[PDB]
Design a protein that fits this description.
35% of the residues lie in helices and 23% in strands. It has 104 residues and is of the alpha+beta class. It comes from Escherichia coli O157:H7.
Length: 104
């Protein structure tokens, strides 16, 4: 278990190299966008992020997608964390923004 910078947060081992996530051991596959959200959330824990911010970071405003699209990918990410029950970490602050609440 060693590859570049493996971000092990709350047992959620994220591998930016292979775009892979392991909840302690259980592999969790999902879309690249979902992976980006999680990776960005990990590099910026306990910080409220609006749809606009995520779009300007993860999506990098590559395409003029709707704000709703953020909720769609966020739902995918959360659902991907549903088995491990880690979805709770990705807090959905209504339709205002989101946040990665590990524990602090």
């Amino acid at each position: 278990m060693a590859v570049e910078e493996v971000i092990e947060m709350q047992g959620l081992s994220l591998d930016p190299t292979s775009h892979r996530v392991m909840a302690g051991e259980e592999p969790l596959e999902m879309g690249p966008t979902e992976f980006k959200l999680l990776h960005f959330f990990m590099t910026h824990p306990e910080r409220v992020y609006s749809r606009e911010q995520l779009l300007n970071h993860v999506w990098g405003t590559n395409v003029y997608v709707e704000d709703r699209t953020v909720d769609v990918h966020i739902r995918r990410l959360r659902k991907a964390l549903e088995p491990g029950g880690h979805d709770r970490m990705v807090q959905t602050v209504r339709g205002t923004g989101y946040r990665f609440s590990t524990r602090f």
